[PDB]
């Protein structure tokens, strides 16, 4: 997210485990 | 004939190691350095520093 200098002050796959 | 069984990267296992995020304008902004430091912890030793 590109901001200026303005400021405040899933799925089910097959795998092995 | 023969098909071409495609493979997704996000559906692999290696994806755990790296965080992938698309940065569209990078090649333009890549003309300069980005240069962010990170941190370093430090113990509170006795005796005045």
């Amino acid at each position: 997210v590109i901001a200026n200098t303005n400021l405040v002050t899933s799925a089910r796959v097959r795998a092995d485990l | 004939c023969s098909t071409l069984s495609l493979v997704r990267f996000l559906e692999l296992g290696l994806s755990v190691a790296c965080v992938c995020t698309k940065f569209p304008e990078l090649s333009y902004v890549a003309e300069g350095t980005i240069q962010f430091e990170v941190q370093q912890p430090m113990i509170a030793r006795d005796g005045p520093h």
Partner: protein, 35 residues
């Protein structure tokens, strides 16, 4: 042309947001703890 640096990426979850205490006057009664 004397290339320069650029603004570094900041983590999304960066929650400094402590100036609420440090803006003008600090109210330690219940504002603390969130930091």
């Amino acid at each position: 042309i004397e290339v320069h640096s650029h603004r570094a990426l900041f983590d999304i979850f960066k929650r400094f947001r402590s100036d609420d205490n440090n803006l003008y006057g600090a109210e330690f009664d219940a504002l603390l703890g969130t930091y």
